[PDB]
Write an enzyme that holds these catalytic residues in place. Structure first.
Site, short mmCIF file in Angstrom:
data_model
loop_
_atom_site.label_atom_id
_atom_site.label_comp_id
_atom_site.label_asym_id
_atom_site.label_seq_id
_atom_site.Cartn_x
_atom_site.Cartn_y
_atom_site.Cartn_z
N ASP A 88 83.97 66.35 63.23
CA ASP A 88 83.79 64.91 63.29
C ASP A 88 83.25 64.41 61.96
O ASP A 88 82.63 65.15 61.19
CB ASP A 88 82.83 64.55 64.43
N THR A 146 81.57 60.86 61.26
CA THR A 146 80.33 60.09 61.24
C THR A 146 79.29 60.79 62.10
O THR A 146 79.46 60.92 63.31
CB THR A 146 80.58 58.67 61.75
N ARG A 149 81.24 51.28 53.88
CA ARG A 149 81.54 50.58 55.12
C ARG A 149 81.24 49.10 54.96
O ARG A 149 80.17 48.72 54.47
CB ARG A 149 80.73 51.17 56.27
N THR A 162 88.71 62.14 63.03
CA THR A 162 87.76 61.05 62.98
C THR A 162 88.40 59.78 63.53
O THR A 162 89.62 59.65 63.62
CB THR A 162 87.26 60.81 61.56
N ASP A 206 87.47 56.52 62.33
CA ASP A 206 87.15 55.41 61.44
C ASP A 206 88.33 55.14 60.51
O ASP A 206 89.39 55.77 60.62
CB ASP A 206 85.86 55.71 60.68
F1 ALF Z 1 81.64 60.40 65.67
AL1 ALF Z 1 83.36 59.97 65.35
F2 ALF Z 1 85.07 59.55 65.02
F3 ALF Z 1 83.88 61.16 66.59
F4 ALF Z 1 82.84 58.77 64.11
MG MG Z 2 79.82 60.09 66.34
#
Ligand code: ALF
Ligand code: MG
Ligand SMILES: *[C@@H]1O[C@H](CO)[C@@H](O)[C@H](O[C@@H]2O[C@H](CO)[C@@H](O)[C@H](O[C@H]3O[C@H](CO)[C@@H](O)[C@H](O)[C@@H]3O)[C@H]2NC(C)=O)[C@H]1NC(C)=O
Ligand code: NAG
Lengths: 1028, 324
Positions: free
Chosen positions: A383, A385, A547, A627, A629
């Protein structure tokens, strides 16, 4: 939808407040535990053998298979019965806790088990709530109590819960005074953050004023109350419906490559045993065809045995050989494996390396069955973030009207006001002495890490947030003005709208609507001319890995506000998916808004995320980043994490490149065309968007011959690192599930920290859950939990490597030492009359697996570092790459079986040629068939113990104690078992055999030689390993 | 927070040996220099032992004992002539050997009641079920029940020496001390109560194949019942189908004259044990026992084979290690 009354009085099926995590109660312990144990192949096979020995006459007494089976079943049941008792006791402490209940005009004391649904519970400070209470009244004003949910979702913040307004003045003043209130809550959900309900209070007149009950009013079970005198609440969910007890899962990920290789070894050893029993039986009746071969006038069959049917005799003869050779299947392998996993699992938790000071927590193990799987990982799905980038956001480069301020009295104030409002940062109210800092102790802590950065960024300028005072908002506007703001409404952020907002009444002005959100969501609302200058500023920050959150306001006239207010409170009334109706009731409110400017925040990587990934690649693992984002923000981090080197060519399967349907067909094939030209490796990296991926996996039925996914997997399988952006949690599971079923068994490890990662954590072979700020959902559903990402280096390279080697050698050693044990007993049948005559005494058959050779292998599998734990983490380049299940394949399996067959032959024919002497003593005495068995057994025990002594590279004092203690126990027990005539024992066949064996010098020399010949290929092998 | 002890952190002080070709090759020379001198000693001391065997089962017309292969009369007395070309120096041991006699058969090995033979009054009256085919005879228990006791070796061998004169000189054969010390004095005991053996065996008969009951095997009370040396030796079931059991022993004389001087000898056999039914063979063996036991070249040859292969391999690896 359930209806709950406060006092169970006029204004049914509810579980009792008694949680039980135990598997077995008291009486179904033996019926269920034994049934589960006998569902295994080996445990059930020794049950069949035991019954065979009892139902018919067999070569050995039933003790030889009843005692070893009874011991392993008991120890296994004790271990499982111990843990089940610990789980029951932990529930006993929670359930046997005194709680104070206002039954009827009395503060009577009842146990936490007795609490039902719809009864007033008084909770004192510094005590966990007994159940899911709705805050009804608090001692202090504003009805605010601070609840610490550190035990539930790992947050030590004193969250401020708000009481019911209609019942505010009930503190210790007739809270039972016929309190008419019918609470209608939804059926319990494991959301832990979403609570929908509706109270219904009845006063003296005919009124039904009703507040929306949300998560702001729900006091969850198992959370510690803090900094409040006393609490009055009403039980709603009590036992197995509480949001605490609805999260007792995370165990459907249990199967290891070593465990299934045990079954592969166990099937072979059943077919070897079938061959031995078939070969002896067919040779027995060839041998017995000679009339004088059987019944040669000295031993004559009894009349019962002579007149029985030959077909039954052939079957019973085959069964007698099965019982004779049954010890080829290790009876103690399951119990030794289970204890090795149970005891060796503590080494992860005990390790001081997996310790984080900030969290005050270490590593926790949820599944011990996957320890050996950590030394077999091939793919790592990570992952973004929280896992790779810690959620510590820093404010940089504010922008106003596309000018990058780093208007001065009108637009400048609004942006800072919008920075100091439109959030829930909830500053630490109990500020210390003002002289400590420039103004005071202003630590900001909140749930969303982005909103903390924005408020701190305003603090760098004049404006500063000091709000949250009985529903009021205070901001210092670069002057001594308090500037109170009345927070009329707040619009909570949700993944659907991708934006949050607040509605605030100006202290000396009109109603405002401050709104935040991503660029792709707010920009359609704002005016077109403002976008053209702001978008490019957003793009540069977005491209550089910052961001961005755009901020806009909206002027609301009082006539507009009244219609909105009536619309908002009406929507809060309704049950039945309020949040979706929330999603629409204020989506149309924020339509025409004026943009101010965007912002940029930084997501710094973790401690050694660049070093951890560098070691993972050096270990031979493919790292993929799944991910959810934006692509360009995730792309920058991948460059920072050294996942992509500069020279890497980026094959972007993004939505901008794939705009046409048939473009995907061509553009997917050219990479196979393009990459295969490099193949006639680490120069190409792939980027995937969630929208593109869904087309590849769903819209794949159109292409049968040219399967979309098969071509897609061929590209991924040979790339450097496949970044995957904008992926929903479902799509994360599909990528993991796709990798698992291809070209054998690629072991996959998925690491995450949020509810978006639970889907892939459960599906992968090994699930690692980081204890992040997002919650404990990932940790609870994971096999192992670590506080930081850099601990994945220690977990895989050191613990995973050691866990695999210890058990891959334990498994090979059990099948080796049992084949050596039986092979003399099989060769003896040729020099017997194929009569199923055991070579060894029944004492040695029983004691071999449980006492003579049971402890030295157990201590090996817990205390053996063939390579030091310090050199394993320091040099990851090769050692992880050495064992790709190499220690348990077809190659090394044939070496152990052939070594066992060679040593098994030397034991027998070494002693067979020794008994051609006609006397081994100076006194001329002769030795029988029981001295033959003990010479073979003594060489056998000394060989298998010393063979393990050669494989040890880490000689602790325990290794000396068990390896030299098992040899010293064999000699003592042989002397003790051969020194006295027991009254109960009937055989008396081993009266003085061992002691008379040692009286001769020739046997002392014969034993020494046979041990060396048997251990010659093992000694010789390590010398050839010293050659180059 | 987690306990920082040596064991919990996988840091127990360990010997941790290091292995290279430089530390294992010297072992090969040492192991190759200790198994060679021992093997030379063992191999030589085996060849010093002088041992002969005499097969007398008959089954051929030329065989002197073929006159009583088939059942003609109960007492057979067949004589075998053999010469000793090398003198036996020390005390000599007499064995009788049998071939194709499966004394290790499963049904045969268990055919005994070791509680009865230990002197148990209750077990004496009722023997166990393990000795079932030879348990009861004429509605009376058998005192040594079982197939092992039933098939006891029962032919007499005698040694004679021929000097200058044609008269034969009998050789004194001793009988004591041919069984293990412990099983005669501890494991095998007579029934407890009584002054004379014949009274202790009241309801028990003799084995079916025997001639004389158990309480009259020997004139000496010390070898009479259940402690007879010839009986105790036969109980110890042989490991292999071809075996040799201690029959008598000719002790060394006080004078310098050897126990068996080189010359011609006669073997007086009271042929009683029928083995031609199962194609078995009967042998008589005279052997001299050294410190290691009998005459076996296995131990001597094996050490030379193991000792040389360790030295030969150790040199070659040293040669390969040196140049390469
Ligand atoms: F914690 Al994620 F995509 F799974 F930002
Ligand atoms: Mg997360
Ligand atoms: C020596 O020991 C062996 C072991 O069996 C005997 O075979 C051998 O001969 C036996 O002489 C005894 C004398 O008491 C007899 O009991 C045996 O006879 C039995 O067998 C015949 C077969 O013709 C049957 O009529 C009947 O079952 C007899 O009881 C006889 N055994 C045989 C088969 O020859 C022993 N000789 C001695 C005691 O010197
Ligand atoms: C055994 O004894 C005599 C000597 O007395 C021997 O010559 C003969 O071969 C044998 N037979 C018998 C019983 O005479």
């Amino acid at each position: 939808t359930r209806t709950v009354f406060v006092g169970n009085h006029p204004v049914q099926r509810f579980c009792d407040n008694r949680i039980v995590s135990s598997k077995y109660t008291l009486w179904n312990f033996l019926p269920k535990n034994l049934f589960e144990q006998f569902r295994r192949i080996a445990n059930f096979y020794f049950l069949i053998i035991f019954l065979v020995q009892v139902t018919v006459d067999t070569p050995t007494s039933p003790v030889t298979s009843g005692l070893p089976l009874f011991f392993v079943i008991t120890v296994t049941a004790i271990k499982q019965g111990y843990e089940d008792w610990l789980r029951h006791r932990a529930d006993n402490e929670v359930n046997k806790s005194t709680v104070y209940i206002i039954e009827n005009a009395k503060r009577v004391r009842k146990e936490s088990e007795k609490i039902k649904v719809g009864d007033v519970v008084e909770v004192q400070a510094d005590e966990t709530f007994p159940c899911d209470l709705i805050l009804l009244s608090s001692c202090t004003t504003d009805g605010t109590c601070y609840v610490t949910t550190a035990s539930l979702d790992g947050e030590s913040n004193c969250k401020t819960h708000y009481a019911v307004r209609d019942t505010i003045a009930l503190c210790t003043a007739e809270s039972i005074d016929t309190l008419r209130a019918a609470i209608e809550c939804e059926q319990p959900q494991p959301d832990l953050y979403k609570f929908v309900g509706r109270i219904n209070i009845y006063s003296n007149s005919l009124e039904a004023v009703a507040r929306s009950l949300g998560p702001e009013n729900l006091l969850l079970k198992g959370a510690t109350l803090k900094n409040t005198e006393k609490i009055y609440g009403v039980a709603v969910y009590t036992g197995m419906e509480t949001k605490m007890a609805l999260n007792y899962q995370g165990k459907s990920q249990k199967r290891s490559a070593v465990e299934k290789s045990i079954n592969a070894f166990l099937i072979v050893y059943l077919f070897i045993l079938l061959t031995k029993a078939a070969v002896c039986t067919t040779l027995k009746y060839v041998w017995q065809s000679t009339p004088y071969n059987d019944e040669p006038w000295y031993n004559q069959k009894t009349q019962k045995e002579r007149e029985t049917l030959k077909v039954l005799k052939m079957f019973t003869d085959f069964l007698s050989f099965m019982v004779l050779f049954n010890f080829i299947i290790p009876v103690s392998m399951y119990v030794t494996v289970e204890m090795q996993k149970f005891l060796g699992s503590f080494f992860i938790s005990w390790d001081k390396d997996f310790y984080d000071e900030e969290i005050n927590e270490g590593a926790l193990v949820n599944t011990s069955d996957l320890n050996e799987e950590l030394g077999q990982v091939d793919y790592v799905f990570t992952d973004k973030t929280g896992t790779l980038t810690e959620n510590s956001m820093e404010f940089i480069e504010c922008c106003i009207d596309g000018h990058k301020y780093k208007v001065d009295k009108n637009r400048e104030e609004l942006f800072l006001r919008a920075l100091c409002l439109c959030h829930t940062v909830e500053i630490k109210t109990n500020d210390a002495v003002d002289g400590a800092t420039e103004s005071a102790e202003l630590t900001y802590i909140s749930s969303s890490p982005d909103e903390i950065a924005l408020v701190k960024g305003a603090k760098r300028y004049g404006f500063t947030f000091l709000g949250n005072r009985n529903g009021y908002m205070r901001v210092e506007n670069q002057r001594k003005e308090i500037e109170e703001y009345e927070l009329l409404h707040t619009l909570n952020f949700d993944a659907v709208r991708r934006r949050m907002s607040v509605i605030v009444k100006t202290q000396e002005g009109d109603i405002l609507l401050f709104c935040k959100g991503a660029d792709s969501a707010v920009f359609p609302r704002v005016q077109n001319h403002e976008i053209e200058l702001t978008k490019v500023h957003v793009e540069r920050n977005a491209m550089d890995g910052y961001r961005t959150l755009c901020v806009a306001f909206k002027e609301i006239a009082p006539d507009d506000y009244e219609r909105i207010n009536r619309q908002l409170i009406e929507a809060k009334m309704a049950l039945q998916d309020r949040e979706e109706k929330m999603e629409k009731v204020f989506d149309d409110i924020e339509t025409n808004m004026n943009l101010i400017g965007a912002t940029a925040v930084e997501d710094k990587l973790q401690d050694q995320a660049a070093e951890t990934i560098e070691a993972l690649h050096a270990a031979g693992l493919k790292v993929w980043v799944l991910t959810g984002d934006k692509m360009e923000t995730a792309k920058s981090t991948c460059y920072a994490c050294r996942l992509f080197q500069t020279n890497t060519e980026l094959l972007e399967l993004t939505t901008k490149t794939i705009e046409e349907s048939e473009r995907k067909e061509d553009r997917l094939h050219e990479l196979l065309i393009e990459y295969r030209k490099k193949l006639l490796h680490q120069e190409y990296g792939l980027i995937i968007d969630g929208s593109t991926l869904s087309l590849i996996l769903n819209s794949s039925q159109d292409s049968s011959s040219n399967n979309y996914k098969s071509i897609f997997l061929q590209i991924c399988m040979k790339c450097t690192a496949v970044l995957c952006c904008r992926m929903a949690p479902l799509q994360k599971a599909q990528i993991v599930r796709m990798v698992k079923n291809l070209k054998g068994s690629p072991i996959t490890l998925s690491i995450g920290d949020g509810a978006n990662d639970v889907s892939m954590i459960l599906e992968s072979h090994v699930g690692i859950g980081i204890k992040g700020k997002e919650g404990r959902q990932a940790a609870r559903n994971s096999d192992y939990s670590v506080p930081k990402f850099k601990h994945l280096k220690k977990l895989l390279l050191a613990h995973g490597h050691l866990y695999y080697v210890r058990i891959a050698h334990l498994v090979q050693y059990f099948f080796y030492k049992n084949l050596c044990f039986i092979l003399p007993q099989f060769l003896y049948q040729f020099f017997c009359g194929f009569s199923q005559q055991p070579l060894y005494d029944a004492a040695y058959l029983t004691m071999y697996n449980i006492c003579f050779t049971s402890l030295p292998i157990l201590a090996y599998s817990l205390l053996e570092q063939h390579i030091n734990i310090d050199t394993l983490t320091s040099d990851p380049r090769l050692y992880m790459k050495i064992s790709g299940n190499a220690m348990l394949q077809l190659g090394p399996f044939l070496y152990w079986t052939f070594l066992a067959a060679f040593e098994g032959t030397v034991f027998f024919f070494g002693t067979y040629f020794l008994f051609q002497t006609a006397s081994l003593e100076e006194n001329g005495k002769v030795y029988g068939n029981w001295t033959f068995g003990t010479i073979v057994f003594t060489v056998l025990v000394f060989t298998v113990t010393l063979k393990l002594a050669l494989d040890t590279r880490f000689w602790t004092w325990i290794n000396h104690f068990v390896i030299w203690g098992s040899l010293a126990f064999y000699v003592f027990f042989s002397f003790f078992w051969g020194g006295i005539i027991w009254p109960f024992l009937k055989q008396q066949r081993m009266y003085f055999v061992f002691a008379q064996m040692l009286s001769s010098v020739s046997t002392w020399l014969a034993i020494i030689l046979l041990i060396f010949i048997s251990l010659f290929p093992e000694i010789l092998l390590i010398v050839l390993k010293n050659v180059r | 927070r987690p306990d920082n002890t040596a064991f919990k952190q996988q840091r127990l002080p360990a010997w941790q040996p290091i292995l290279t070709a430089g530390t294992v090759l010297p072992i090969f020379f040492i192991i190759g220099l200790i198994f060679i001198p021992i093997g030379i000693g063992i191999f030589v001391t085996s060849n010093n032992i002088r041992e002969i065997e005499i097969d007398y089962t008959g089954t051929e017309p030329s065989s002197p004992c073929n006159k009583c292969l088939s059942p003609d009369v109960t007492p057979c007395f067949c004589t075998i002539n053999f010469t000793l070309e090398k003198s036996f120096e020390g005390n000599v041991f007499m064995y009788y050997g049998l071939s194709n006699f499966y004394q290790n058969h499963r049904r045969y090995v268990k055919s005994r009641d070791d509680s009865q033979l230990n002197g148990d009054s209750s077990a004496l009256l009722n023997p166990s079920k393990e000795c079932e085919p030879y348990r009861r005879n004429e509605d009376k228990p058998i005192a040594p029940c079982g197939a092992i006791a039933n098939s006891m070796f029962n032919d007499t061998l005698e040694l004679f020496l021929i000097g200058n004169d044609s008269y034969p000189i009998p050789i004194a054969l001793k009988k004591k001390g041919i069984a293990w010390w412990t099983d005669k004095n501890v494991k095998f005991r007579n029934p407890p109560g009584g002054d004379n053996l014949e009274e202790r065996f009241k309801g028990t008969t003799k084995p079916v194949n025997w001639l004389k009951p158990v309480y009259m095997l020997d004139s000496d009370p010390d070898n009479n019942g259940f402690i007879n040396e010839d009986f105790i030796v036969w109980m110890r079931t042989a490991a292999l189908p071809t075996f040799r059991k201690l029959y008598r022993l000719i002790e060394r004389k006080s004078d310098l004259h050897p126990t068996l001087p080189a010359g011609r000898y006669s073997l007086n056999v009271t042929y009683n044990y029928p083995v031609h039914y199962f194609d078995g063979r009967k042998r008589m063996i005279l052997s001299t026992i050294s410190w290691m036991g009998g005459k076996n070249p296995f131990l001597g040859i094996a050490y030379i084979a193991v000792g040389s292969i360790s030295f030969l391999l150790g040199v070659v690896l040293l040669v390969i290690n040196h140049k390469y």
